[PDB]
Each structure stands twice: as structure tokens, then as C-alpha cells.
């Protein structure tokens, strides 16, 4: 703890006698190699010490006498801190001292080739220190620096190498990472300085590249050139020998090929009209070099698979170069016949690279393939009189179709996930990298399919042939093929699609009969179903076939093989969603709609299915019932639909009426949970008309909820927290949650706020809300709050009147759980502020209708919300505050009183958040608020804040108030800084990104001690910008 | 002890600590109690070629609690940069973690993880994630909550360090 | 034409399990290549094979009870453990003297394994639907009392209606006949008291399913009499049939209304 | 202030007599309350803050409060455990931690004018009724257990809850005594004024002074003092209990108004060992049994109480109620009745904040934290490095 930490820190920082390097080395070595206690404390001590305002004073000694690299490095961290924050207030002779010690040490170390065996790591840290110094005083106090080092590079080769590293780092700090670390204007200034003095350095680099035989030096030079390519003027790139020098002297030699190719890729990324020929040159030469190191006769898939890290890196870098260049400049090479062979080679390369089994590389390639297919599609969207660009790519397009069909990713991603409770459910991932991959392959293949229907159907038919004759037969391969077949659904004309499908399912059925073994047959059947389910147009077109299919599904719902039941249900819910009407209406050759038949055979259909599969089934049928429009018929359908679960439900409710303690019976609670899950799924499908069922069980349901709640609560009271880990309480909480889910689920899809408000809302008040209030802290289900939010979001005006009593049950008691820290009871913080957001957004008059003393508590709850380190809570908090300000602006009666009451408190709390590093995520919101608020002060606030209203105008008062507040909060700030910031608040109150940047600037300024009269805040550029923004 | 040093970096509220803890205990932490400086947890996997130990340096991603920062990166053998697919900022901050990291560790295997892919409102789309490409980093969508692609980072790193691309994890 | 061909082919010959006259599909009176009218001889041949038992049942009950498998006309791993019937189509003429009938309640078929402290139920597919405490041997906490039962779970009555037994406290009954198993089961079941009652130690009531002879009078009787459950259908066992997991003609199946058109 | 909850039949007058000594030397007021059924109210009132600082009852209920986190863990210095006997400490022990201080061990009371001779068993007492008639408590399980555990009584092999009791032979025989005529204020009214043949009712035999005497299977209920964990007075309570109560004086001042019987304090128990009553009351513990301190006990107590009322004259029997009492042994109580929606919706219904006064009258009244305001000599170088530090560029 800070006991040992403080003690050791003080021992090291006493300053009354010689510093214990032995001890420091020991603490450091403990940190890098010690155990959790010893290491904890070492960590504590080192951080603690590093913080101290005078620790830097000892760094020189640390660098002078310490023998291990780690301690030196630590000392450098100590130094870096001072330079970063207190450099402008050190006694200047000390600054000079640090400058000399640092560049001197860098000379002595870098001018030793031992630097490698020496501490490369350590040297990087040194150079970084120098770059920090430069950042703090260049060129103002170091105007000859670039000349000095560029000149000193001609001295030694090692010195030059390290100098290249320094320049690179400086480039990174000035151009790449200046945002958030350097103020906007200072950043612009440094960028201008470097851009100005670049030609000198570029001459250095050109000299080194053209002449040096030193491999480390050359490499460092190239690595530096990479960043410079990130920012330098295009003349240096496209009007010098650079591109050539890279391709002829460096691209082919192994140890330089990667960096060289990366440089080339950066250059290739540039989109500029004037250097067409240079670009062509770039491509040609690059290609001619590539073919030497990666001949087109290479199995790039194997070459990657077996290959070492740099080989792999080179293949990836290659794919990047070709993809980049082709995407930005394909047109250039297209209109040059003399480049055909090269273009082809490039494409050929791509194809080879595509066969590589590595999803990242393949995504890189697929990016380009999708580009090409998209382009050719926009050129002309018609099949095989021929467009020019397409005619250029005709020799290889079918290879791309073949690639898409052959390597098609899985369409959906199913995942076995165990709930907050025990249950292992199947979770379908909705938006992931893999599904994105699939969607992109599908997109490309659809493009290419439109370009040629014949070629696509021919490819897939050949693949299927190859499945039948066993040449390419594998579960994986069959799956992939069918995934492709389904992926192009809708891309063909309906009659064509039918003609193609008939062939597909006929041959797949044949293959199913043909193969022997239940495994193979199961896989084939699964794929057949998948394809069928992906082609609903076909099913809708032909009723007899659809009926046949569905009957087959029902048949396979008994199949003992794993997967077949799952697939049967999954397919069934697809077909149900996409062909719902065909089950409600009477079809030709039928006396009754299919739904009646299904409902008449439900249990026989689902007797062998597991619970989750049954839910899927009920959901699927639920869609069919939703499809029936006649309210009466639909009501009867819903009634028969929910017969079986209602029987068990009724039995249990009866048992409970006779005796409540069966609600403590494990299997009973399980049954309840299952029944409720069925009701939820059903409700999702049917929608509003499900009310007839909901209303039927509603009050009973509420009762059981209550009971179980109470049960759970006591279980806490008796056995504390731990008791919430064993099966029973778990399954009970499950029942509560499914109850809430059912309620909010139906409310969300209810198209009558009146009825909901009068009927279904009042019982909740005592059944769930007052129960929530009644429960023990740990017993309270957070999912209550959230559900209420939903209801509010759905009702609004129809429930405003009820907002008070709701707040009686949940608000007060929930606060006390979440106002002692920011960590405990997270789901409650989340859901609570969700509810509060809902109320403020849809039922603001309720706030106008509640006592002031309580409104203070609400406002405080909001502030408290945006004070959170939890991202979503703070986010919602800021949103609420914004919409609340707007809401108040709407009601002109309360507006002035509200402003007069809370304006300054809000401002100061917000400012306390903005100046905090841990809240930067809400920057966009912060600005948006302050801007708005400050805008309001320009013309929309009639009353005056202080008694002397006349000497104290709104804007004036603000300016001096915010100024004094920030001055007292941050005493180390300068008057000019603060005044400039505060006028920046008014000047930019209609330019949000600018305001945001202004805030980032202030955030950087408050973290470093400028001190007295040191003015590198560039008031002219700043006040000019503020002026121009003020004009608009 | 055939063990490796893994450094885990990323913004605050990203999922680093929860991820490691779940890999340890098996539970899933609901609370956000920010890491201070660094917490190192030994974490073992059983491979077909014997056991392997990752000493995970769960570092703090809040600037306020940064601690020794890069100091923690010294002698690291591999790394996991992590961000939140529900917070675009955490992703835009990845190049910072990467620069600070690769300055101390010039040549180590690194995996970029998009965490919290279980949450529906995905802000950082898979389409937008490309930083690793030019940096030759390995990428994975993961979820410390629904356990999606839970062991892929450690598996890829293990393969890279050991040199056996066909290495696989086993029960015990 | 090609579409009629397709639909017809899909209905007729699209099968994974590939068993004849499967109850997974509706009655063949409405033709699959997996639809047959020649049950008779098949039954005889099947019974001929049972006679020379060349399979290891004891060990199998052991594997089921303690979940242990090893090595390479029998299944393993909790799936496909139940004896399933064909549709009753080719009625045997030695019916009334050699065929029993069981009236089957509406419910979900379940393999029941009581062992090591607990009882577990499985679908035909091997999915463990539930684990509960039961008075059945090996079903309570209170390591060698294992029991394997064939059941039909009725949700309404919350009752596992025991259709058949395959193991009771170590001793297997795959080796025995249907009639002897029915007697043995129907004797061991009522003589264990609370087993048929909702205790804390046993929440699910286990009840034996009454079986009857198939004399033209007895059939009118069983058709007439009431039952404590919604009748799903009728299962006509052969008296000597060993318990053989998977589909078989040695037990037939019929809907209640269909019986009126089967010699009575 | 320390607000004490204690039973009414005990010496709640003497505890105040000690509380005045505390009040004189401490300044803290000691209000010794006696509300409606403390053993039920104490665990419930802790839900909304209210409740006593320290509690007094037998150690059968403390087990329930202990796992909850209501009883403040006490760690008295080892010099204080020397004063009280080890087994009493074992009586209040729970999970290896002390939740309460052991105060006093809690016999046969009779009129010596009517029944001088002592029966060594219960079988030959009823027959002697017919003599006097011609010329104890009924509802609680506390008083009716002496014979229930005479023939055969949570068995200790630790108290396994799946092993509860025979209990029939002892209860039925007593019932037959109620049927042939061979509760609290009705029976005792006869004991006091000499109209019939624990130590919490010994001093009451004074104004009428019926000739008393203790003679020879009850409950050994160690009266204990538990500190509440929700109270701020955790340190001040143990001051009171160790230095003012468990002493020569304190326990004496409590014993003076109404005897405690056998007490845990060594120095004060050996003074009272000469006493016939206290020597014969610890004798009841020799053939008696030490009472469990677990959350599984309370259901048992209530069950024991119900089986006994209807056994005499009601709508239940003994074996019929023992078959149910057997099964009455996780959560003691939670919910009681299922149909309560209708009960609530037609009830009185109270009101709460956000539902009373006026909003558009005022907006402001008078009044990282919630509700708070926002929180926001020698130059460095010397040696080779500084020297070599002329600059990259030279002048
Ligand atoms: N939905 C979802 N939430 C997650 C997931 N992983 C973590 N979280 C939540 O996000 C928060 C992450 O907290 P930590 O893991 O401590 O954050 P950290 O990355 O260690 O942040 P620092 O300690 O500041 O470095 C926790 O509140 C988790 O509940 C996930 O996969 N899905
Ligand atoms: O170790 C199991 C093996 O089987 C599966 O793949 C094979 C299958 O074994 C073959 O019989 C044939 O059907 O080709 C399949 C191609 O998927 C598993 O998918 C595979 O991982 C595994 O090697
Ligand atoms: O997930 C799918 O769609 C494939 C179909 C056959 C088995 N798996
Ligand atoms: O699957 C079952 O258990 C019953 C048997 C006859 C048909 N359905
Ligand atoms: Mg952390």
C-alpha cells in the first residue's frame, strides 16, 4: 500500500544525502521479475516516485551510476514527465543542462556501433526524450537544429542512422500523433516548420539511399521515409528519382523488400491527376521486381503456409500494394494495350494470393474483387454488344466467380452461450467480421451473376456434378456450394431461377438417395433444406411443393440424428416468415388452410423436439397466425395455438391456488419458465393481437411473479448474497425475467396506447414496481427499470399522469443503491438512467408537475450519470441533460426560473467533467451542450443572474464567472489562456467541431505548466480564427 | 517454465480485465472497476505439445491511472491491443497504443481484438476495422460475455511463439 | 410436370433414417419406397434372430448408467436407445393370442436413466431434457442401484408414464420378452410406495402403463373405457419380442379412430 | 444511544438498574424497551434501518440472524473469554465467529403445600390429580418439550437437517393428560396464589410466597446479547456488555430483581453454586440438551408450537401433526398467499414523494458526490555527456 510506497519513495527522494542506486535497481528488478506482493509494492513505489515534482533532479545520477537498462529507462520516464509538463517553469540553466546531457548522451551512444548490442530499447527512449525537448523548444530556442543534425549526419554512419530514427520520431509526433497532445495552433506551427526545413533532410535521405552500403542505416532511412511519405509534398515523391531508387535498388533485396514495398504502397495510394505516367512507371517497375521474388509459378497458399514471418508479411504487403494501386488507378493501365501482360500478371497475382488460407489476406483481396465487380456492374448491368472494361477482364472473371463459389463463407453464425442463469441457449450473432465477410462475398458474387447468368449457373451445376461423382465430395465442400447457391437468391429472373432450382434440388435429392450412411444423408438433407428456405419466391409460386416441403420438415422433426431437427426447425421458421400468407389463405385443392392442420397436429409434430426447438416452432407458427387478418378467425387461431401451454399453466396456477409452496418446487418453476418462454416467442411473432392470450394469463402471471420475487427476496435475507448462485433461485429469476420480457415485448408491438394505459399498466404498479421497492437490494431485478422505460417510450402522453407514482416505487430506493460509488450495481445504473431518459424524452410535463425539491434530486441524478466512468451511463446522462435543456426551452413559463436556478451549477459540473481526461469520450456531447447553453446566453435568457443586473449583463457575467471558476480550479493557468478559452466559448457556439477542438486545446493546456509570461499560445492566429468563426 | 510475457493494452472500459478474469475463474464481471497501473495474472493453457503459461500484464487504459505506461512493455514477448466495437473512440485510439507498444517491442506478435461484439448496437463496423492490415497485426472479433472467439487470440499467439501453426488447446 | 416430378420425388424418397413405415411420417395409406405392406415375414425373421442373442446387454446398461464408452446392430451414447414401432398395416392373424396392446397417453417420449444420485430424461435424439431426483433406484442421493426405463412424459399430469423397462437395479431386460417385462415392471412399480406420488425426493410421478390382450372383445373394451390422460394412440407389442432399440415391426402403432377399421 | 430490546417476563427492570450505572459514567442513555415479540421484529426491522443496538433472547434465533449479516461480529480480548465458560462460548459460536456474548443458562416449579414428594417420572403424576381436584404453559413449544424428548427426541453426527424426529410417545401421553384433566396467565395464576401443584419466574413467588423448590428433559437456552451490525454503536455496545453487564455488579443487579439462574461468569457462578435451585437447574442440563444455533431452528419452533395446540383440542391429532412437523424441517418464510393481486387492489394504499404539494409554484427552495458541487545549486548535467553536449552542429 501507499505506506511502504511512501516510505521507500521518501527514502529515495529525501535529497539530504547520496541516492541509493542499489535500492532503486532492486525495486525496479522487483517490478520486472518480482511476485505479486513484491511486484505490487515495487509498482506502487515507482509510480509514486515518478509523480514527485523533484524526482527529475535525481535522473542524471540514475543515468550516471545505474548499471541495468531498466532503471535507466525508468529515469528517462521521470525526465519525460518534467519535460512534458513543467519544462517552461524550470530554472532555465537546468533546462539547458538537460538539453546538453541528453543530446550529449545520444551522441556518445549513437556514435557507437555497439548501440545494437547496447540497449536499442533504451536508445529509442533517449531519442524520444530529445523529441520531447524539441517539441517544447523548437525552433524558437533551437533554430539551427535541423541544419545541425543534417550536417552531423555526414560525420558518422551510425550517428546518421540514429539521426534518421530521431527525425522519424519527430515526424510521428508532429504529423501523426499531434492531436490530443499538442494544441492546434502549435501543431500547425511545427508542421509548417518541418515542411519548410524538409528539402534539407530529403537531400540527406537521397544521399544516404543513393550512396550508402550500410544496411542498418539504409533500413532506418527507409523506415523514416515511410512516415515522411505520410506527410511530405508530392513533388519530392513524383518528381525525383525516389520511386525508381526504391524499385531498382531496394525492392528486390530481401532485407529491404518489405519496407520498400510499404513505401511503394503509400505512394500508390495517392490520387492525383498530374502524375499519370509516374504512376504507370511505378506499376510496371514494381511488377517487374515482384516477379523476381515471388514468381507467378509459386503456390502462394503453400508459400504463405510454410513461410516465415517476413515471407508472410511480404505476401500481405503485396496484396495491399496491388489492391491499393488497382483500386485507385485501374483506369490508367486499362487504356494502355502495351500493359496487358502486366495487368493480367497483377490480377494473376491476386488470384494466387486469394487461395491463401488466412482471413485477413482474403478480406484484402475480396475488397478488390468487390471493387472490380461493382465497377463492371455500374458500367453495364446486363449479361453476356460487349462493354469495353468488361471485355478487358473477360479472360479472368469466371475465375473470380469460381473463387466466390468455392470459398463462400458461412451465411449465419450460431453460438452456444450460457445465460446469466444456467440455461445454454443458441445465440445468433447479428453483426460480426465473419458475417460481414459473407455479405461481401455474396455481394461480389451477385454482381458477377448479373454480368453472366449462364456462367454462374454453369459453375454451380458443375460443382454439384462434382459432388455427385465424388470428385470434390466433402461435407465442407457441399456446404460451401449450397451456401453460394443460396447466396445468389433473387439475382436471376424467376423463370430462370425456377428452371435452375428444379435441377439443383432434383440432383441433390438424387445425391441424398445415392450416398450411403446416415451422416452423409443428414448433411445433404440439411443443405437441401437450406437452399429451399433461401428461395421463398419459388415456394410461393408452387403450393403443392411448399406443402410437401413443410410436411418433410415435420417428418424430420423426429429424426434422431443431431442437426436434422435443428435444421428442420430453423428452415421452418424461415419458410414461415417468408411464406406466412400461404398458410392462412385457402390454397387451390385444399378445403382448409394449412394452419388449421398444423394446429390440429401440434403435439404429434413436436413430441421429439427439445424445449428450445419447440419455442422456435411456436414462433414460426406465430408468424402464420400473424398473417391472418380477420380478427375473429385470428382470435380463434391464437386460442388453439396456445392450448397446450395454457393447460400446464392452468394446472400450475390451480396447484398454487391450493398451495403457494409449489412455487418453491424446482421442476414447477422450470415448467413456468418454459411456458413463459413459449409465450414470449409466440408474442414476438403474433404481435398486438396476442393480447387475447396475454390478458388471459396476465394477472395470474403477475401473481406468480410477485410470489417468486418475494421468495427470492427472503432467500437473500436468510442466506445473504451467495444464495443467488444455486439452481433454484436461478430458475426463479428466470421466470421473473421472462415475465418482464413478455410484458415489454407485447407493449412494444401494441398499436393502442389507450387500452394499454388503462388496462395493463395499473396492475404493474403493485405487482412489480411496489414489489421492486419492497425487495431487498440484492433481490431487485434491474430488468424492471428497463421494461418500464420501454413502456414509457411506447406510451408517453398516455402514461404521463402515472409517472409520479412509478417514481414513488423505483426512483428513491434505486438511487440509494447507486450513489455511494460508481461501480456497484451496474445494470441498475444503466437501466435506471435509461428509464429516466425515457421519462424526460416522452413525459416531460411530469417534471413540470412534481415538487421542486424532488426535481433537484432528478437533476442531481442526471449530473451523477454523466460523472460516470462507465461509458454508456455517462453518454445517456449527457443526452438527457441536452434534451432536458431543450424541453425547458419549450416551456416558456418554467424556462427563466430553471435558468436562474441551475444554469451555473450545470455549467460548473460539466466543466469539471470536460477538464477531466477520463471523460473525453463524451466530448462531442459536451461541446454540443455548452455551445447550446452559451448560444442561449447571447439572446434567449431575459432574467439576470445577479442582483446588480445592470453592471452584470448576461454575457459579461458569464465571461467573468467562467474565467474566475477556471482560474481558481486551475491556478497554474495564465489570464490570457483563460480569457481566450472563454471568448472561444462564445465565438464557436455555432461551430461544434471547432468547439470540440477548442475543448481539446484547453484540455492540453491545463495539463502543463506554462507559468509566467511565456506566450506560445499564438494569440494572433487563435483570435483570428475565433474572429472568422464569429463572422459566420 | 515455457512461459511468455503478454502485455494487454487498450482504452478504459474496453474489456481487458474482464477478459483475463473470465479466462481465469470462468465468471463474467458486470462492474467496471478500473485497473490501476498494472495487474499481472499467470494464465495457463494446455496444448497438444504440453502446457504453456501466459503472464498477462493487464494494464490500465485510463490516462489518469496509466502508471508506468510503456515501462510495463519492457521484455514483453507478445501483445493484445483491445478496443470496444460499441465505442468508436476506443478504436481511433488503437494507433496510440500500437505506437507506444512497438516502440518498446520492435518485433513481437500482436493481436487486435474488437470486444463486446455481443452488444447489438455495433458502432465500429467490421468494414471500418483495417488498422492491423498495414501493421501486419492479427485481428479478432471477440466477446468476453457471450464467449465469442474467446481463445483465438491466445491460440494465435501461442502458435506464433512456439512456431507450431497446428498447435491446439486441450481440456486439461 | 417437372415440378410434379420434383414434389413427388421429394415426398417419396427423401429420408435420412430410412426406416420402413415410419411413425415420423403419416400413415402410408395416403407411396414411399419406405412404405411396405410386408411386415409379416419380417416379424418372423426378426424373432428368429433374437433367439440366438449375440450382443452384450449388461455392459451396455453399465455404459448408460456410468457414461463410459470404449472400442469401435446396436447404438451408443443416449441417442437411439428406444424401441420404435412401425405403422400397423399388415395385421398378424395370430393377434389375439400373441400380441399385447398398450394405450399410449399424449406426451413426449423419454429415455429414463436413474443412477449415481439422480435421474435424467432423454429424447430419442439423445438430448438430456431434464435432471431430477427420483424414488427410482439410483435416482436418489441415497452408486450401484441403476435403472433404465422407457417412458412417455405427460406434462398435464406431470407424470412419466412407464411404457417399458430395460434395466432395474443392475439387471438388464433387453434379454427378456415383452410380456415378462410388463409383468416385472408392473410388479416392481406399485410396490415402491411414494414413487407414484409427488414427494420432495420425487417430484415426478412414475406410473406403469396398463397393457391388454387383443381379443376382439378386449379391444372393444379398451376402446370404450376411460383413461386418466388424453389417449394419443395404441401400441401393439408382440409378446416374445426382446427390447431392440430402433425401428421394428415387432411392435405396431395406430391412431384410436383407425382401430375401427382393423377387424373390430 | 443504546436502545435495548428484551423480554418482559425476565428482569427488564434490573437491566435498567445497570443502564443507570452506564448512563452515569458514560453520558449515554439506556432505554430498555420491551416491544411486541422481538424475535420476529428484529430481523424484519433491519430492512428499513430501524432496530435495537443489542438484543436479548436464547441462542436458537441468533443462527438465523448470523448468516444474514445482522449480528456484528464480536472479538473480545482473550482475557475476557477467561471470565465466561467455554461451552457457553460454543453456544454462541457460528462459523468459527462470535456473534453474541453468553449471558445466562435457563426447571420444575411446584407448590410444596400440595405436592411435597417428587415424582422421578411423568407416568405417576396424573393419578394424583383426582385427590386435589376432588378436594404450565400450553401454546409454546418451550414449555411442552420436557416429555417430548424423554422417550426419544436435527441430529448431531454438525446438525444434519435431513435427519429430524419417539416424539410420539412423549406427546400423546401429555395429550391424554389434557383430555382427562389430570395458558400463560391462566396456569401461572394458579401457581402464584397456591391453587395448583424456566428460572424466569422465581422472584414473582414473593408477595403470595408459595413454598418453592426445584426438583428433577428441557431446552438449555443460553440467554445472549447480540450486537447489531447496522448500528453505529458497535464499539460502545461491547463497552456496555463487557465492562458494565458481565461483571460482579451488573449480573448481580440483574439477578436481584429477577434471577438469571446459571450464568456464564466464573466469578459470579461459583458464588451461586451453593444455591439449591441453581445447582439443580444445571442438573436439568445434565440430562437435558444444548439448543442448536442455526437458521433451520425457527421453523422447527413454530411447528412444535402448532402440533401441540390442536393435539389437545382442535382439528388435528398428534401423529397426524408429527407427520407434518417431521416435514417442517431453506427459507423459513417468504410469501404466504398466492391470490394477493385482488387483496392489494382493494386495500387502503399509502402515498409517496412525487405525489404531494405543488410544482409550478416554486422551482428553487433552500438546501465526486451526489448532490455535491463539482470537483475538478547544480545544473542537471555534468560529466562526459554534458561536455560532449556541444551540439550535433558545431560553431
Ligand atoms: N456486453 C459486453 N460487455 C462487456 C464485455 N466485456 C466487458 N464488458 C463490460 O465492460 C466493462 C469492462 O470493464 P474492464 O474489463 O474492467 O475494463 P478495462 O478494459 O480493464 O478498463 P481499465 O481497467 O480502465 O483498463 C465491464 O463493466 C464489463 O461488464 C463483452 O464482451 N460484452
Ligand atoms: O475427425 C473428424 C473429421 O470429420 C469431419 O470431416 C470429414 C469427415 O470425417 C469425412 O468422413 C468426410 O465426410 O469429409 C468431412 C469433411 O468435413 C470433420 O468436419 C473434420 O473436422 C474432421 O477432420
Ligand atoms: O449451417 C448450415 O447452414 C449448414 C447446412 C448443413 C449443415 N450446416
Ligand atoms: O414417438 C413416440 O413415442 C410415439 C410412439 C408412437 C408414435 N409416437
Ligand atoms: Mg482494467
mmCIF file with all atom_site columns, N, CA and C in Angstrom, chain C residues 12 19 29 37 45 79 81 94 113 127 149 156 165 168 170 219 222 224 227 230-231 233 241-242 252 255:
data_model
loop_
_atom_site.group_PDB
_atom_site.id
_atom_site.type_symbol
_atom_site.label_atom_id
_atom_site.label_alt_id
_atom_site.label_comp_id
_atom_site.label_asym_id
_atom_site.label_entity_id
_atom_site.label_seq_id
_atom_site.pdbx_PDB_ins_code
_atom_site.Cartn_x
_atom_site.Cartn_y
_atom_site.Cartn_z
_atom_site.occupancy
_atom_site.B_iso_or_equiv
_atom_site.pdbx_formal_charge
_atom_site.auth_seq_id
_atom_site.auth_comp_id
_atom_site.auth_asym_id
_atom_site.auth_atom_id
_atom_site.pdbx_PDB_model_num
ATOM 1  N N  . UNK C 1 12  ? -41.621 -38.763 -51.719 1.00 0.00 ? 12  UNK C N  1
ATOM 2  C CA . UNK C 1 12  ? -41.490 -40.218 -51.780 1.00 0.00 ? 12  UNK C CA 1
ATOM 3  C C  . UNK C 1 12  ? -40.149 -40.750 -51.274 1.00 0.00 ? 12  UNK C C  1
ATOM 4  N N  . UNK C 1 19  ? -36.073 -45.818 -42.409 1.00 0.00 ? 19  UNK C N  1
ATOM 5  C CA . UNK C 1 19  ? -36.844 -46.946 -41.900 1.00 0.00 ? 19  UNK C CA 1
ATOM 6  C C  . UNK C 1 19  ? -38.203 -47.077 -42.593 1.00 0.00 ? 19  UNK C C  1
ATOM 7  N N  . UNK C 1 29  ? -51.188 -45.213 -46.009 1.00 0.00 ? 29  UNK C N  1
ATOM 8  C CA . UNK C 1 29  ? -52.436 -45.422 -46.743 1.00 0.00 ? 29  UNK C CA 1
ATOM 9  C C  . UNK C 1 29  ? -52.739 -44.200 -47.608 1.00 0.00 ? 29  UNK C C  1
ATOM 10 N N  . UNK C 1 37  ? -46.030 -53.202 -47.177 1.00 0.00 ? 37  UNK C N  1
ATOM 11 C CA . UNK C 1 37  ? -47.178 -53.914 -46.631 1.00 0.00 ? 37  UNK C CA 1
ATOM 12 C C  . UNK C 1 37  ? -46.761 -55.293 -46.148 1.00 0.00 ? 37  UNK C C  1
ATOM 13 N N  . UNK C 1 45  ? -38.740 -63.373 -39.145 1.00 0.00 ? 45  UNK C N  1
ATOM 14 C CA . UNK C 1 45  ? -37.285 -63.391 -39.293 1.00 0.00 ? 45  UNK C CA 1
ATOM 15 C C  . UNK C 1 45  ? -36.572 -62.674 -38.135 1.00 0.00 ? 45  UNK C C  1
ATOM 16 N N  . UNK C 1 79  ? -28.570 -41.736 -27.583 1.00 0.00 ? 79  UNK C N  1
ATOM 17 C CA . UNK C 1 79  ? -29.453 -41.456 -28.697 1.00 0.00 ? 79  UNK C CA 1
ATOM 18 C C  . UNK C 1 79  ? -29.790 -42.776 -29.360 1.00 0.00 ? 79  UNK C C  1
ATOM 19 N N  . UNK C 1 81  ? -31.875 -45.132 -28.275 1.00 0.00 ? 81  UNK C N  1
ATOM 20 C CA . UNK C 1 81  ? -31.870 -46.219 -27.301 1.00 0.00 ? 81  UNK C CA 1
ATOM 21 C C  . UNK C 1 81  ? -33.242 -46.882 -27.155 1.00 0.00 ? 81  UNK C C  1
ATOM 22 N N  . UNK C 1 94  ? -52.339 -64.100 -35.839 1.00 0.00 ? 94  UNK C N  1
ATOM 23 C CA . UNK C 1 94  ? -52.194 -64.682 -34.508 1.00 0.00 ? 94  UNK C CA 1
ATOM 24 C C  . UNK C 1 94  ? -52.202 -63.564 -33.472 1.00 0.00 ? 94  UNK C C  1
ATOM 25 N N  . UNK C 1 113 ? -32.876 -42.576 -17.188 1.00 0.00 ? 113 UNK C N  1
ATOM 26 C CA . UNK C 1 113 ? -31.707 -43.184 -16.563 1.00 0.00 ? 113 UNK C CA 1
ATOM 27 C C  . UNK C 1 113 ? -31.528 -42.684 -15.136 1.00 0.00 ? 113 UNK C C  1
ATOM 28 N N  . UNK C 1 127 ? -30.859 -35.844 -26.486 1.00 0.00 ? 127 UNK C N  1
ATOM 29 C CA . UNK C 1 127 ? -30.823 -34.588 -25.747 1.00 0.00 ? 127 UNK C CA 1
ATOM 30 C C  . UNK C 1 127 ? -31.367 -34.789 -24.335 1.00 0.00 ? 127 UNK C C  1
ATOM 31 N N  . UNK C 1 149 ? -35.449 -46.973 -17.804 1.00 0.00 ? 149 UNK C N  1
ATOM 32 C CA . UNK C 1 149 ? -36.873 -47.079 -18.113 1.00 0.00 ? 149 UNK C CA 1
ATOM 33 C C  . UNK C 1 149 ? -37.247 -46.400 -19.433 1.00 0.00 ? 149 UNK C C  1
ATOM 34 N N  . UNK C 1 156 ? -49.328 -32.378 -18.397 1.00 0.00 ? 156 UNK C N  1
ATOM 35 C CA . UNK C 1 156 ? -50.506 -32.033 -17.605 1.00 0.00 ? 156 UNK C CA 1
ATOM 36 C C  . UNK C 1 156 ? -50.499 -32.729 -16.243 1.00 0.00 ? 156 UNK C C  1
ATOM 37 N N  . UNK C 1 165 ? -39.523 -51.318 -19.450 1.00 0.00 ? 165 UNK C N  1
ATOM 38 C CA . UNK C 1 165 ? -38.323 -51.333 -18.622 1.00 0.00 ? 165 UNK C CA 1
ATOM 39 C C  . UNK C 1 165 ? -37.204 -52.052 -19.373 1.00 0.00 ? 165 UNK C C  1
ATOM 40 N N  . UNK C 1 168 ? -33.378 -52.746 -14.230 1.00 0.00 ? 168 UNK C N  1
ATOM 41 C CA . UNK C 1 168 ? -33.821 -52.461 -12.875 1.00 0.00 ? 168 UNK C CA 1
ATOM 42 C C  . UNK C 1 168 ? -32.807 -52.943 -11.847 1.00 0.00 ? 168 UNK C C  1
ATOM 43 N N  . UNK C 1 170 ? -29.430 -52.886 -11.791 1.00 0.00 ? 170 UNK C N  1
ATOM 44 C CA . UNK C 1 170 ? -28.360 -53.701 -12.336 1.00 0.00 ? 170 UNK C CA 1
ATOM 45 C C  . UNK C 1 170 ? -28.790 -54.692 -13.400 1.00 0.00 ? 170 UNK C C  1
ATOM 46 N N  . UNK C 1 219 ? -60.609 -55.503 -27.188 1.00 0.00 ? 219 UNK C N  1
ATOM 47 C CA . UNK C 1 219 ? -60.358 -54.306 -27.980 1.00 0.00 ? 219 UNK C CA 1
ATOM 48 C C  . UNK C 1 219 ? -61.534 -53.337 -27.896 1.00 0.00 ? 219 UNK C C  1
ATOM 49 N N  . UNK C 1 222 ? -61.161 -51.806 -24.347 1.00 0.00 ? 222 UNK C N  1
ATOM 50 C CA . UNK C 1 222 ? -60.153 -50.763 -24.208 1.00 0.00 ? 222 UNK C CA 1
ATOM 51 C C  . UNK C 1 222 ? -60.516 -49.532 -25.034 1.00 0.00 ? 222 UNK C C  1
ATOM 52 N N  . UNK C 1 224 ? -63.617 -48.582 -25.308 1.00 0.00 ? 224 UNK C N  1
ATOM 53 C CA . UNK C 1 224 ? -64.713 -47.990 -24.549 1.00 0.00 ? 224 UNK C CA 1
ATOM 54 C C  . UNK C 1 224 ? -64.231 -47.258 -23.297 1.00 0.00 ? 224 UNK C C  1
ATOM 55 N N  . UNK C 1 227 ? -59.671 -43.138 -19.643 1.00 0.00 ? 227 UNK C N  1
ATOM 56 C CA . UNK C 1 227 ? -58.291 -43.105 -19.168 1.00 0.00 ? 227 UNK C CA 1
ATOM 57 C C  . UNK C 1 227 ? -57.984 -41.791 -18.458 1.00 0.00 ? 227 UNK C C  1
ATOM 58 N N  . UNK C 1 230 ? -55.267 -37.944 -21.926 1.00 0.00 ? 230 UNK C N  1
ATOM 59 C CA . UNK C 1 230 ? -55.708 -37.876 -23.308 1.00 0.00 ? 230 UNK C CA 1
ATOM 60 C C  . UNK C 1 230 ? -54.996 -38.964 -24.096 1.00 0.00 ? 230 UNK C C  1
ATOM 61 N N  . UNK C 1 231 ? -55.765 -39.895 -24.649 1.00 0.00 ? 231 UNK C N  1
ATOM 62 C CA . UNK C 1 231 ? -55.194 -41.020 -25.379 1.00 0.00 ? 231 UNK C CA 1
ATOM 63 C C  . UNK C 1 231 ? -54.565 -40.570 -26.694 1.00 0.00 ? 231 UNK C C  1
ATOM 64 N N  . UNK C 1 233 ? -52.591 -42.819 -28.665 1.00 0.00 ? 233 UNK C N  1
ATOM 65 C CA . UNK C 1 233 ? -52.783 -43.931 -29.582 1.00 0.00 ? 233 UNK C CA 1
ATOM 66 C C  . UNK C 1 233 ? -52.617 -45.317 -28.993 1.00 0.00 ? 233 UNK C C  1
ATOM 67 N N  . UNK C 1 241 ? -41.181 -60.436 -28.026 1.00 0.00 ? 241 UNK C N  1
ATOM 68 C CA . UNK C 1 241 ? -40.183 -59.515 -28.560 1.00 0.00 ? 241 UNK C CA 1
ATOM 69 C C  . UNK C 1 241 ? -39.191 -58.982 -27.518 1.00 0.00 ? 241 UNK C C  1
ATOM 70 N N  . UNK C 1 242 ? -37.901 -59.215 -27.744 1.00 0.00 ? 242 UNK C N  1
ATOM 71 C CA . UNK C 1 242 ? -36.855 -58.580 -26.939 1.00 0.00 ? 242 UNK C CA 1
ATOM 72 C C  . UNK C 1 242 ? -36.896 -57.082 -27.153 1.00 0.00 ? 242 UNK C C  1
ATOM 73 N N  . UNK C 1 252 ? -46.386 -52.565 -33.345 1.00 0.00 ? 252 UNK C N  1
ATOM 74 C CA . UNK C 1 252 ? -47.091 -51.722 -34.289 1.00 0.00 ? 252 UNK C CA 1
ATOM 75 C C  . UNK C 1 252 ? -47.719 -50.534 -33.590 1.00 0.00 ? 252 UNK C C  1
ATOM 76 N N  . UNK C 1 255 ? -53.609 -44.984 -34.636 1.00 0.00 ? 255 UNK C N  1
ATOM 77 C CA . UNK C 1 255 ? -54.436 -43.939 -34.046 1.00 0.00 ? 255 UNK C CA 1
ATOM 78 C C  . UNK C 1 255 ? -55.734 -44.565 -33.550 1.00 0.00 ? 255 UNK C C  1
#
